[PDB]
Amino acid sequence: AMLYPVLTQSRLLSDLSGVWNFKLDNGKGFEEKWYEKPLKDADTMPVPASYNDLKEGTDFRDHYGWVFYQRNISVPEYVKSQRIVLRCAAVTHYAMIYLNGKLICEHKGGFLPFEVELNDDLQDGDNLLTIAVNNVIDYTTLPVGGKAPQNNPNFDFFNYCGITRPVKIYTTPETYINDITVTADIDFTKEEPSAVLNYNVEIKGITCKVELFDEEGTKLSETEGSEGTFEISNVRLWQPLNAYLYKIKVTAGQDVYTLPYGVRSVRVDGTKFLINEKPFYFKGYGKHEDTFPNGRGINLPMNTKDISIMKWQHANSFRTSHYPYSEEMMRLCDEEGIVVIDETTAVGVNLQFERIGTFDKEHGVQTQEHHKDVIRDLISRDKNHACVVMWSIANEPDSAAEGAYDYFKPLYDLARELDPQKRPCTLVSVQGTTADTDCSSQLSDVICLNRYYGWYFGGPDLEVSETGLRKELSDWGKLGKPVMFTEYGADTVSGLHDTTSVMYTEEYQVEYYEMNNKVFDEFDFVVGEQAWNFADFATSQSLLRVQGNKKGLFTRDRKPKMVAHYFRNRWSAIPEFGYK
Amino acid sequence: AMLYPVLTQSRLLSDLSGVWNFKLDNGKGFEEKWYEKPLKDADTMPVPASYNDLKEGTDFRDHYGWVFYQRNISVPEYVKSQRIVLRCAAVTHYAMIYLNGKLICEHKGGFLPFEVELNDDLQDGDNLLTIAVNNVIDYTTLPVGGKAPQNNPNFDFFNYCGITRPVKIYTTPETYINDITVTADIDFTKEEPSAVLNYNVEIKGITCKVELFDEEGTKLSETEGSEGTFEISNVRLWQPLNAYLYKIKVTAGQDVYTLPYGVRSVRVDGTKFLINEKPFYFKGYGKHEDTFPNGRGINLPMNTKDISIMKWQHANSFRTSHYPYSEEMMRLCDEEGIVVIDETTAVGVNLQFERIGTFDKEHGVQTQEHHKDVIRDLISRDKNHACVVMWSIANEPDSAAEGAYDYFKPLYDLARELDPQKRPCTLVSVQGTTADTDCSSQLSDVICLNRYYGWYFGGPDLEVSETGLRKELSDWGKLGKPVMFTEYGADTVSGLHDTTSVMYTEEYQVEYYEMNNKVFDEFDFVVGEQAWNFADFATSQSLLRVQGNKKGLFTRDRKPKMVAHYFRNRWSAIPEFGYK
Numbered sequence A, B: 001a002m003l004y005p006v007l008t009q010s011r012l013l014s015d016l017s018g019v020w021n022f023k024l025d026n027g028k029g030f031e032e033k034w035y036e037k038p039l040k041d042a043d044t045m046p047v048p049a050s051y052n053d054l055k056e057g058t059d060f061r062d063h064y065g066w067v068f069y070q071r072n073i074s075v076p077e078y079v080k081s082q083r084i085v086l087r088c089a090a091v092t093h094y095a096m097i098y099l100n101g102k103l104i105c106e107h108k109g110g111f112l113p114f115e116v117e118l119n120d121d122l123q124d125g126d127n128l129l130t131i132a133v134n135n136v137i138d139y140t141t142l143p144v145g146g147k148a149p150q151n152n153p154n155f156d157f158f159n160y161c162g163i164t165r166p167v168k169i170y171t172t173p174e175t176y177i178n179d180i181t182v183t184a185d186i187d188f189t190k191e192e193p194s195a196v197l198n199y200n201v202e203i204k205g206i207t208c209k210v211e212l213f214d215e216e217g218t219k220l221s222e223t224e225g226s227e228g229t230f231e232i233s234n235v236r237l238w239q240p241l242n243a244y245l246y247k248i249k250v251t252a253g254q255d256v257y258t259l260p261y262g263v264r265s266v267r268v269d270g271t272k273f274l275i276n277e278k279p280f281y282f283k284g285y286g287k288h289e290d291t292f293p294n295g296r297g298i299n300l301p302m303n304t305k306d307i308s309i310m311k312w313q314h315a316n317s318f319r320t321s322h323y324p325y326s327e328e329m330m331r332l333c334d335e336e337g338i339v340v341i342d343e344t345t346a347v348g349v350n351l352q353f354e355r356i357g358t359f360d361k362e363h364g365v366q367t368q369e370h371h372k373d374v375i376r377d378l379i380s381r382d383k384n385h386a387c388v389v390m391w392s393i394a395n396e397p398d399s400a401a402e403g404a405y406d407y408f409k410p411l412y413d414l415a416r417e418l419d420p421q422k423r424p425c426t427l428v429s430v431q432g433t434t435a436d437t438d439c440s441s442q443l444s445d446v447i448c449l450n451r452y453y454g455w456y457f458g459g460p461d462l463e464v465s466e467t468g469l470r471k472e473l474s475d476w477g478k479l480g481k482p483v484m485f486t487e488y489g490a491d492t493v494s495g496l497h498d499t500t501s502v503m504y505t506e507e508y509q510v511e512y513y514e515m516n517n518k519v520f521d522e523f524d525f526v527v528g529e530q531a532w533n534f535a536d537f538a539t540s541q542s543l544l545r546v547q548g549n550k551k552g553l554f555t556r557d558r559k560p561k562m563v564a565h566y567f568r569n570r571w572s573a574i575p576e577f578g579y580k
Ligand SMILES: CNc1nc2sc3c(N4CCN([C@@H]5O[C@H](C(=O)O)[C@@H](O)[C@H](O)[C@H]5O)CC4)nnnc3c2c2c1CCCC2
Pocket: A155, A156, A157, A395, A396, A430, A431, A450, A456, A457, A458, A487, A532, A549, A551
């Protein structure tokens, strides 16, 4: 369980972000005890941020192995009173915290938070904090390092690493709040729908009371109970592009924490994805925590810029593509009313492109245990987010291979059981699968395709490509379930133009999406269009990557390609609800 | 006096940065008491960052007037023990802090820090912090708003405003450290130069002792005295591109603060700018705190990227162009060994381009009082920075007009008297002045020109332009002083190319700098070449601005133009010292 550190009367918060000392491991790093003494001949390195692009030459950009972040720490003795904790929101890949020279914590997983307490190794005076980060990826990591001394991603984005998100120090009373959970039942029956919310607070280390406020701070109800309930008639339902967030003050044993919460219902019904009992239609794109020169590092300004562009463009949703995003971005979609598809680090679980099969148990992937710890850690983190309407177990696994069904079912189950809101589960299907062959047809509530008819398939022949896409999508309808496209797009170099289009031209990109959009619009069970990608992003080099991935509607610096004006006009004529 | 808030055994630091509530004033804002209640129908807005580009449409970008930032605050009662302070590192233009509804502080000046104490209005529970920001610029602001309801900058950059730099909360013992000062005397005579540093600590609200450490934390000397001294034989001299920073722990009355410091000497001698008694040569550029979509907002990653590019390019210096930069960037140049020319907000003090004269006292500028408070606040902030080797009182004032000399002398004097290191003073001369006509010839230790022979003057005729530049620079030598160019450049659209160059082409830009660089190299009293600009940046719209200022060597996203490879080759063959 991981609550978002905030400033409360009961808890303090001090950011450690800034320029830290930094050294690339030379192999002999751990041998000598760098985590013991202050790094020598060190380099400077802002935190929070990916370090790959922040220096010059390939030696930083393409480093294999470990790096050492190092910074000094010092708390006021008058604080030992309360509990001292170190929250690392995300260290890409493996983290190893040393204080004063001793290991204190260790973590696997580059995109989710982890904490460690400091009360009993926090010395007096100036303490030597050391965070060593490893970037190696393999068949035991999610995301999955392939075989082709260098990391070779089995995924189409660059392997940005370092202290990707912030490192803070918060405190707490000795017995504290540790995990608040809230769910809602809404009775749309009444012409003025109302709702009953179920609280479930948890403490560790006494009386606990719950206060419920409205948008403006107006209190409206109170109760006591580490597992009580609450009633709200004439309830302001959170809605896509129309967020309403209540707030919640849990006072419990000299400790109080506040939580926003939006009241809405998610439910699949036949070929309809329903939000607050209405037939939604996804409009938006798959995104990437990718900016220059931050790498995958957190970027509050671009977060707001990205959401400003989405509203300008008349979109309503995005998918945390290939990894969970920052907590800040998740809260922002709550405030702004952005429907989010929250997705795990499970990309590259596919060895298809003697031959080893993906789910061979001696020579194939070794990810299921960690895949489970991710599903749990992620749902623990974002369970209370009204923006989250669905979960994505994995992006493009070899889901039509043998071993496939056996791999994923234990993970779907774990997901369906750990979501206090029992939200729809899916996985994003790669090109090649079909209704009959895809283990997703059974395990998933929503069929999410990534199809590229007009690019990989059939490009530059958009007629032949249309025939293919009708044929395949037609078949997908026989499952009687909601199907949305989570990726489709074409690599386009901003600036390349032509009257009779050729591939890579802004005109070819617009035509591609006209064909796909025409076919989408023929099937009432298509409940979503999400283009890949929102914006150009960095990938590993290869002959097929024109200085990265150029499938964005926008450039890496958020300037619109012609296609961005095509979608803005199309999405403006398509409602959040009732499109079918 | 303003010390950089850091984490010490005696003091805590909690960042307030994040997504704050935000509303554009509609005129009726102050009338109604928005600073009293929680903003209603608010918008989201990251802090720290300029807000102009973070939303869509001209209504944010071009707002005239006030905006309201608003966030909730809550400290742990167990802190009232110590002093509570709110440090606003920079609110562009005018700031007005309200707590719980009461004004607590007010500030003028968009680029320097200001604080306010909270102990006696900091309520218990959740407090409503409100920061109202004004963007209006006029003859009473530095920088100077011109006459041509809209702000019209009399300066060539966009009027980015909002909470430009971070807002934090630190604490202190009741009697505390308030301003440490250190100076150095070096005896280059000895073949192993040594040095004696003079401490000068200050407290407010007891024993105080000073500890001196070396790079790696090795203590090396101790003493007691709020105005004592210190001795260091075999001293590691801070040097351009070879920084050595000692550290300093001032323990005083249950309060301790640490300070880095580099030992170096700055001294002009004839036509030689001497650092550690050696003839330096400035290599670098004028920069701008300008990134997308941050605006003028702080950007730790780009700060490190910018400094990585400078070392890649073989530069040694930059000028805080048109305003002081963040404290973080200033400390970074200390660590990295970047020579900095620290400059004030005093740009647009020039009405030349019945006619009013700049320094008319009824109808011209009204900036001298504030100009003084800036010189003092700035030197108070950066006095201890080894990277700072010079001060810039103003960028391109009408320095050859009547009233000119009378305006600036009181400011030069105030500057020369308040710098504990008695560092060189200058002002950057606009095109048009000459040795005879420029009040800078007398008041300044270094003549700093901004010339544009090859662009504004003479372009596209580089021959005629060379004749002009030789003629003018020749004359400037008669003053027997060091002269460096702080700006020269040509607007260049990355991507426009030609074999026979035309203006705006990457080839014309390279040729421009070849001509100017050839002439520079003829005069041994030219001690510096700093190109304008390091990178493309945003300006107000006009027929002469091709989507901003395109004079960068790099694009706004830090990608090199051809000229960036020309300088990197040239600067690699030119030493920091002894070039003449
Ligand atoms: C019609 N038959 C084909 N089908 C396919 S599928 C495929 C392929 N994957 C697709 C799916 N993406 C997904 O989409 C995005 C992207 O690819 O840009 C990624 O960014 C994103 O992370 C990822 O989710 C990951 C990788 N990569 N390369 N070639 C192909 C290929 C080809 C053909 C025909 C021969 C030429 C190649």
